Design a protein around this nucleic acid. Structure first.
Lengths: 244, 244, 244, 244, 242
RNA sequence: UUUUUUUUUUUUUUUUUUUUUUUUUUUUUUUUUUU
């Protein structure tokens, strides 16, 4: 009858600070959990998950995220191996649900071996090692993939942490321009806005301890015992600010 | 026979100023319409309509208006609850027909509790409470959503009414720029033109009596017994004129 | 056998000036014939055709030509009345076949009452009376619709006829820019080319005698006993040449 | 085994100058076979093919090549006659397969009666006779259609043959700009890249012998027994070069 | 799951195993051996006579077989329709397991270059058109498939001259077949054809010994490897023209 | 990334058409995988 009464009576009901906060927690934007990726890898692989993940790292770094597209233009042995992975690990393309697996997600979740693989697969990347060497004097190979952001230790000192991030952002700038054609004509600031959000999210993520993250950067020879980066890292940081 | 005669005789008929004005009222554009929203909420919900509406207000304020898009990046419990609401209340996205329900309509019809929910969900909004506090000294939390325009009493005195609308417009300026990317580069006047039409339509709407609407603004502590707005509201009106 | 012979012998046949002219008359472009619209209105309406046409004039002038689109965002009483008209008069949208009815066609056929209705529905038009008053000093309300072109008497003297057409063109310029978004950025000349063709076609149409059409313009107070237009028309004619 | 050997042995095979030239003749681009059009006209018409083809000249010269589009906006008698022809002669629109019939093809394969009919249907063309008379002093009505290019005798002497091409191109420049809106803004060279190219093939075609082609021009009154242009053809050749 | 990942990352990377994977997961997109493997699989004995028809077909008309089929003679349309059904012929750049007219001509580049001498004026860019740009342009270079006949083991300046000379046609060819490349500069057009051109030069198919013999047979280079004056003139013509 | 296959009697626009906006707009958050 009177929808006036119904609306005020609904508003008159006391707002529960805990009930509303329990809803926002439930209706929260489900972020990228590396923990779910490894949980799914074991769910489909079991024992073969480690050997198959190594194949998927190479696959994501050299070809891409679209598995049924790369399958077409591939060797007889390769096409069969890829087709098997799509059927076994229920691999998809793009950005699907949290419960789904992609080549981009495997490589990003197992960032440790992914950065090590970059030293080997330097000239098979969308942006080759020689291309990056022409922009910055001997660019770090371990920084040549968006998954490196997950290896960055945020507990690093101010200037040292900023130098690493601005050195890695040199590749991100060159990477985004290659894989996305509409970002070629746009300015540095426009490209920066596209990759800064998931980059910093990986740096400040709960996955991989601050102690082990720093050890990984030390192992790749990016920073010393204290935390001071290499001359090449510092050179790439200055190169990123000068280049557009 | 003679279509010449028929046309002139039709025109010769005296035009009734009231009959034609009664037709334009009947054939008028009916976009939102709150009475229908509550009528539809009871039509599908029945008894659960009040508890489900509380979930939908939180859902619209924190995530958005697109329900099938937010469903993808959400928790196992959350995705199921949202999927149920889309099927139960036949929830859509954007601006559909008057007979259809949207998250941005449910929140706007139950504007009473929606404005109260903003005090709790301050930092979960697209424009956080801290962001607005940096623009205006302690910005009113109840003014931090387009649905507030439906709580504005137009029977308010000239300067007092203008101050409230200019204070609320400050959020509408910051809100539109965040949710719509092409409005980021455009001027204050360009952004103003996009939100002034539905805002004033909500202020001058027949839903919620002028007596009860003023009582709601008093309850939120926006205006006093007479109608003079609070210092924080007056500071936001001056802040809207200075900022671009 | 020899298609060479067949082709020359066919061409050798003398061309009949009357037979070919009788064919072009039969294969002639049958555009908007106002006689068919009134014929169709009586075919579906019968006795109710006059009351329903009055509703359709208001409907076309205030909302538009798309009847199923306007039906969605309309009142409970309005939606039912419109839905009935689409089913009764088999109303369509856009530019269909000569045997089909559209809200524009009904309003253009019965141009006599359509121009009279404009005086009442001044602020409910896409371009309001106040908007046109800011461009030309007190713009004629009867000229504020593309159906007015059918009320223009072509037997009018040179300068007098040109003044009316240039004054009406001012609204068409403002009207086309509002209803068609791509015509907003384009020049006056570009917009002019879109409406000049159907406008002049309505002026030089066989429907409504030259004697009665001049009487209609006199009744609206656009021209005097001789044919000299009002100051309001002359000021609108000069405004069209100055504005872009 | 060794696909290296197979490829070189294939290449080692001596290329046969005649066999390859017999293939290019077989795999040659056809497009518009006037002999096939008359063959198809008799296949569907039989005895009525001559009377029906006369009706098809007007339809392509006054309305266009799209038969189902022109059918909509046509008289009760006209719509029935056109609908019958589309069903009888299996008439299509645009540029379909060699085995298909179009109104442009029926008016091009029997160009003789088409050029003779262009005198009667002068003001019903997309570019009227008066429009062409304002550009060139009394333009020959026989040249006012792309089908006239099939009458141009290739056995006519050098500059006498170059003269018809410098006269027939005056109408085609005007014609293309009217029927195609995107060609209005483009330069004379851009129009030439779309109309002079399919024109040379029409002039140099096997259909209509060298003797009969020269005879048709004498019947209209364009060039005499050798190839000297007429008084109206001489002043028109100059008009093409002057215009842009 | 952190410990699970740390344990995975610590594992020593095998330089050979990873390099054996990238070889298997390589783009390839041609093989050339696969094209002949496919041609024999559909043709058998008729594959050699049908390939000769397909070379002429690709050189004179194009790569789209169902489009050219429409505007063709009664005998021609039937022959083409048969080839599309027999060899499962497609258009554009499809999967490695698929066949196209461009691929049939590019894999059997040997006879394709020989056919150019005959089909000179039936090409998108005629022999006379190229003769007006460079003094008597080599007919064997007048097709993108020629890049597969270029011997990379050629000396520096000699190899560069051949590539510069062939690039002149590749500039004129791309501008004709692709309309949006007409207004663009030499450098913009160069970027479109340099990638598949160099890929064909550095391809494993056809030995370096036999490749040089093919260039000698066409009269492009001498016994040593020095190109003919017509080639040298086209190399300077490519640098001067835009 | 041996890609790009254009073209050649094609192309047939207008002629009472064209109907926008209004509790709208709901962006980001390991996305983007191009030749």
């Amino acid at each position: 009858d009177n929808y006036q009464e119904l609306a005020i009576q609904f508003a008159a009901q006391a707002v529960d600070r805990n009930e509303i906060e329990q809803w926002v927690r439930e209706f929260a934007y489900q972020g990228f959990d590396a923990r779910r990726v490894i949980e799914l890898l074991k769910q489909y692989g079991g024992a073969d998950w480690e050997k198959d993940a190594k194949k998927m790292i190479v696959l994501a770094l050299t070809r891409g995220n679209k598995p049924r597209r790369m399958m077409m233009k591939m060797s007889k042995e390769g096409k069969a191996t890829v087709e098997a992975l799509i059927n076994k690990y229920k691999l998809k393309e793009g950005n699907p649900s949290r419960d789904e697996l992609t080549l981009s997600r495997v490589a990003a979740a197992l960032a440790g071996r992914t950065c090590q693989a970059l030293v080997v697969l330097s000239e098979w990347l969308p942006v080759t090692g020689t291309t990056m060497d022409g922009l910055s004097p001997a660019y770090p190979r371990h920084m040549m993939h968006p998954s490196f952001a997950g290896m960055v230790d945020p507990s690093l000192p101010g200037d040292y942490l900023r130098a690493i991030l601005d050195a890695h952002s040199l590749y991100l700038l060159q990477f985004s321009r290659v894989i996305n054609p509409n970002l070629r004509g746009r300015t540095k600031e426009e490209v920066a806005a596209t990759f800064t959000q998931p980059m910093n999210a990986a740096v400040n993520s709960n996955f991989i301890s601050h102690e082990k993250r720093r050890e990984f950067l030390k192992a790749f020879g990016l920073v010393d015992s204290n935390g001071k980066p290499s001359a090449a890292v510092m050179a790439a940081a200055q190169a990123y600010k000068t280049a557009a």
